[PDB]
């Protein structure tokens, strides 16, 4: 739309929200592949930051591409290689959600604030295959990665 469209150029950082994401219950509904910042530079945030981010984005993109296809053609024909990213992706999609402190009336969850390193690390790990055992759901609406691990157990029945 000429308006939103015309405004992008005025910004240094952009958080793009999507009803498609929100529609799934993922709050804040930011679109990981449509949100940008001018400081997303290795020279500025560092490569650990950077490599992670980019890492996170690749997989989500990788998964987007496949979504529509395994939809019809199903999952069997997919390579283990490719069905692990379906895994990790769905998990990340969740780890990205977070209970806000201003939305308890909405989520029915205590708001969590996460520090930069807790973030980087948590994702770093997911990306690393270090949680391929825990269930996705354990990754939904939680703060720090530890709550995802704790929640696995609680979910363990």
């Amino acid at each position: 739309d000429p308006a939103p469209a015309t405004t992008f150029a005025h910004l240094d950082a952009t958080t793009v929200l999507s009803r498609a994401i929100a529609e799934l219950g993922i709050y804040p509904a930011v679109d990981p592949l449509d949100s940008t910042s001018r400081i997303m530079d290795p020279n500025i945030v560092g490569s650990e930051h950077y490599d992670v981010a980019r890492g996170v984005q690749k997989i989500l993109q990788d998964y987007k591409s496949l979504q529509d296809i395994i939809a019809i053609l199903g999952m069997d024909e997919l390579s283990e290689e490719d069905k692990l990213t379906v895994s990790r992706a769905r998990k990340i999609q969740r780890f990205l959600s977070q209970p806000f402190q201003v939305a308890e009336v909405f989520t029915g969850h205590l708001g969590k604030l996460v520090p930069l390193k807790e973030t980087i690390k948590g994702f770093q790990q997911i990306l690393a295959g270090e949680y391929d055992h825990l269930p996705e759901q354990a990754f939904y609406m939680v703060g720090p990665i530890e709550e995802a691990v704790a929640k696995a157990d609680k979910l363990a029945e």
């Binding site: 496949l66 024909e77 997919l78 390579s79 490719d82």
Partner: protein, 127 residues
């Protein structure tokens, strides 16, 4: 041109098959080959910003995969390869590049020098 040309061609060829990759549960090695050349050539086309290269460097690197040297290398490493490879020749081999530059093409000679330069580097690499 000496390089650009075959690259342009294997890529186009990859592009034909690409979609198959991710489901390639039983490929003939014919096409499975083009799949491989594809991803490496593609990784060679990647580039960080603010670091424009000299035509000579570009061909040196392109030569590397185009000739097949990185075909056995891991896709995950090409980025690393190139970086170091190029750091190496920009350091050590300014006479080859200076050749490539001057002669404007890849002499049969410089061709052979690159062969050893890359086959020894690779070895270095996969330690």
């Amino acid at each position: 041109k000496q390089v650009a040309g075959t690259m342009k061609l294997e890529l186009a060829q990859y592009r034909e098959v690409a979609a198959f990759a991710q489901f390639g549960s039983d490929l003939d090695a014919a096409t499975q080959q083009l799949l491989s050349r594809g991803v490496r050539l593609t990784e060679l086309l990647k580039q960080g910003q603010y670091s424009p290269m000299a035509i000579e460097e570009q061909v040196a690197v392109i030569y590397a995969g185009v000739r097949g040297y990185l075909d056995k290398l891991e896709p995950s490493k090409i980025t690393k390869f190139e970086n170091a490879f190029l750091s190496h020749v920009i350091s050590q081999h300014q006479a080859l590049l200076g050749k490539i530059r001057t002669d404007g093409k890849i002499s049969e000679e410089s061709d052979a020098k690159l062969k050893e330069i890359v086959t020894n580097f690779l070895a270095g690499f996969e330690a």
